[model samples]
Target: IVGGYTCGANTVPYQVSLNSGYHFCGGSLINSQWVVSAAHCYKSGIQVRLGEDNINVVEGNEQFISASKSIVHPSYNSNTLNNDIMLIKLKSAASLNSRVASISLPTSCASAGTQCLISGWGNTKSSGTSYPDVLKCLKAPILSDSSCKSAYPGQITSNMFCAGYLEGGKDSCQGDSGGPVVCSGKLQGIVSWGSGCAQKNKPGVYTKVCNYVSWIKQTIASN
Candidate 1:
């Protein structure tokens, strides 16, 4: 995350790192056996690491587990990146603790101007490679539908929402996809895409998780 600070230990217990050989994406533990992430981050052999504060070290609190199954939204569109959410069933349930826990899903839609906290291990700059080993977080406000539409005309959809400063500086970046955007102690959005990392008027876009609550619940129940 650009212009962000390292998160305190256990402050973001629900956050998980989606890794193959290394951290490639971020996700949230929705329950002991289920994770919420972005569709674009889905891949076979992906592993989920819970209780991770730093990706480079083997923290004793960490729990590395593989995915049993992954289900992307049926209408997910790669070209437009609409409906960009996914669910992963864990090979084994994550043991909850102070440094590993599940987050509650949002009960209502987040309105414009609502301040949210976005955490990740993504890049720290708009240019160059400087992903932090420790999880980073930024406090960004939700942008209005019209404001987001104006920034990325014909790109923003109902399933997507933008957050961060219109003038840039703070935002989610590459490798942060599927990370949590938390508001009012609930999961609000999933890091999806952006025009450029923290560019002026180009805030980071996210999957509107509130729109997929039913689908997430049903998918987990049936599968």
Candidate 2:
């Protein structure tokens, strides 16, 4: 996370590390056996790591689970990023503990100007290639649709939301994709994509999770 600070251990229990031999993207444990993340972040044989804040150092509380199945939204479009969400089915149910828990889905739509917390083990700087071994966090205010759309113009859409500062700094950097953005104690957004990490006048764009409630429910039920 750019312009963010290192978070305490287990500060965000729902935050998970998505790995395919190495840490690549972040994810949220929506349930013991289910993880919601961005389809674009997945590589082959993705593994989910729960209960740990640090990526390089694993503690006893951490739980590792293999992905039995991955269901990317059928309408997911890489070019346009429409329906960019995806769900991962864990091989077994995760045993909930102090450092392992699920995040609640949104009860309603996200409101404008809501302050939220985004946590991840992504790149520390927009220009730096090195990522922090420890989880980092930042408090960002959700941008209104109008304000977000203004920055991206034709790129922003209803299925997506934005957060960050117009003047730049304090944004999710590279490797933070698929991370959760918690707002009002609910999971409101998923780190989807952006023009860059922390570009001027451009905020981090995320997939609106609330809008996909029905789809999520249906998918979870059928799978």
Candidate 3:
């Protein structure tokens, strides 16, 4: 994440790196056997690296598990990037512990100006290749729906929400897609897309996770 600070070891236990040998997208462990990420991050043979603090280090707490299956939102639209959520079922249930655990899903919508935390191993710079090895996090306030719509006219949808500074400075960058946007210790959103990294009047947009709580539970229960 750009303009963020390094997260303490295992502080963000639910964070996971979707990898094929290297981190590609960030995800959150929502339960023992399922992970929630952006549908855009889907791919065959995605390795879910859990309990990871540093992608480059051999953190003893890490667990490299293969995905048993992934279910993307049926209504996902790549054309406009709507309904960007996805659920990944692990090959086996993750052994939950202090260093590796699941986060609770949101039951209510987050209000404007609600403080939230975003964490990822994505690019650290607004432009260029400056990816971080360790997980980074930032405090961002949820932007109003009207303001979000104003930022990207005719693009923002009911399925999307935005959070960041209107003046710019901090945001989730490339490779951060599917990462958690946690508020009140619950998963409220997932990093989806934006006009550009940390751009003025162009805050980072995310999948409104609360809207999919029932879909997520049903998908998990059925599959």
Candidate 4:
């Protein structure tokens, strides 16, 4: 996520709005019955809205489903934000259509500088608490591990990565947590945390999904 901008309503069909009561955290539909998001987004009263760009209007293609079982990464660390990932099993599988679909996971990690996109119904600007009623998107480049480590000092780990502009102004602000960071049409990261919205030299940090391929596949297989 970066500078405030609007994307085509149906551009990202896999984007999902994870509603924790009145709060909005984003998610990505990985399959008909599974969603991928951040472990920090775990909480009660969670619901998911799919196939709709604008949350205000009830689109004909949109489907609302309640979450059944949610499993956060077993090794997730809240303090350090390591392994900040989760899988949500829907009580009712999403009804896929043109406006609603699932995103593909990357078989390999995305290289640094890949043009990636983050979409969500998060705050348009970092200076406020207000969030968008419609889905918004921002473009940013995936930074190398060393570059990310430089930005976060000792905070960057093997399970984490960074994206966004070092100059500030563009980033996934509050309410954009758990959203997808997609590159070349594949999900590469999960929005985890950052210092403060868009700060100079403080890019948005994310859960490195590529490193979790085995875990994800195994979890899905056994569950």
Candidate 5:
């Protein structure tokens, strides 16, 4: 997943148009007042559009929210991709409707071999660059800690989660970074790293939500 840049032709999704030119992968409403996304998706002139399927088109049910403040994890490291999460405090609470809703944050749920869902406006194919307006999703099973440790050795940390096909051909790509990894209808992980879209022996790595639960709570509370 790529971050730390402008929402150019390569970064911004089509269904959601950016008035201030900020690109983001995926975002979830936490409450009427706040939305959670990735630290990498954080930029100076970013805006968010809620409840839209197609990024290019603006005709659908959408709530344009301007980010009043962006709080990135203080420990975030771009080189190692650590603490790769952030929250966007909207200028005002979003109006709840069929098009806008908050995603439930898991208080306690992290088990090996759990099945999960990941959605983003990333490329469908491993070789292809990126999709313009369409948001795509895929299912992956969370692997056992021991299994992932064997696969990634020291690279796999307790702070991260691992998923995707070991045989390759299914993984999160460049633009999919900073997106949600949902399991059992609750947020579990944040898409962080991989060898390169769907490569053999290289699974997708995510920031384990469980590890950051206290941090998340404190951050949200402070805001």
Candidate 6:
């Protein structure tokens, strides 16, 4: 999470790590068999740690799950960030514990104007910074259709949703892409992109989870 709420205080609050120690931006526990995260988070030697808050290999209720396979969204495009999602199948099931709870996905209404919450270890500012072990969270009101359309002009699409502070000073910055956007205690969106971190007149864009419900269900069901 962004430490102290200033954008540069990025840190890892989860129990996962990249082989090169790169910070993970998104995650979801799908059933007991897998943990979903961003496709970009995967590399040749990636590592998955769960149920811990320390990022520097601190000892706790941690479970290291090796990736059995990495499945990125087929249409993923790095330049444009389309379909920027992925799943990490753990080598084995994770033990259900208080620190490790399954995140619920939104199935009913996830329409515009809903208030949502996002948490991550992303930079607090636009400048690049290292991740922090402490998790940070922020609240953003879901953008109305008219407002979102007016803001993005041609960029707003059916597959995407928008939200953030209109006056600025709060948002998910770099390293937060692909993290969860929870609404009413349910996962509603995935951080995608924005003009910049917490800039005026610009809100963060996210993958509309409601729009892809079938995709997510099928993807997880088949596995």
Cα lDDT computed for each candidate against the true fold: 0.93, 0.89, 0.94, 0.86, 0.69, 0.66
Clashing pairs in 1: none
- Look at candidate 4 and give me any clashing residue pairs: none
Model 6 C-alpha lDDT per residue in residues 1-223, reported as the tens digit of each score = 3323422222222223333455655566655666656565656555666665545555566666776777787777777666667777777888876666666767784777778777666777655665655556787788886787787788777767788767777788776766778888777777778886777778888877666667767887887
Q: Is candidate 4 or candidate 5 better by lDDT?
A: 4
Q: Which stretches of model 2 miss by more than 4 angstroms?
A: none
What is the clash tally of candidate 1?
A: 0
- After superposition of all CA atoms, the RMSD between model 6 and the true structure is 3.6
TM-score of 3: 0.99
Per-residue lDDT tens digits for candidate 1, residues 36-119, read 999999899989999998799986789999998999899999999999999999999999877799999998999999999999
Q: Each prediction's TM-score against the native?
A: 0.98, 0.97, 0.99, 0.96, 0.85, 0.84
What is the C-alpha lDDT profile of model 5 across 14-100, one tens digit per residue?
Answer: 122223553456666667866666676667766777666566776556778887888888888877777778877778877776456
* Reference-based lDDT, residue 102, model 4: 94
Q: Which ten residues in a row have the lowest lDDT in candidate 1?
A: 2-11
What C-alpha lDDT does candidate 3 achieve relative to the native structure?
Answer: 0.94
Query: Each model's RMSD to truth, in Å?
Result: 0.7, 1.0, 0.7, 1.3, 5.6, 3.6
As for candidate 3, its clashing pairs are none
Give a tens-digit lDDT track for model 2, residues 54-90.
7778666788899999999888899989788999999
For model 5, what is the C-alpha lDDT against the true structure?
0.69
**What stretches of model 3 exceed 4 Å from their correct place?**
none
Q: What is the lDDT of candidate 4?
A: 0.86
The RMSD (Cα, Å) of candidate 2 is: 1.0
How big is the positional error of residue 144 in model 2, measured in Å on the Cα after superposition? Answer: 1.1
Worst 10 residues of 5 by lDDT: 2-11
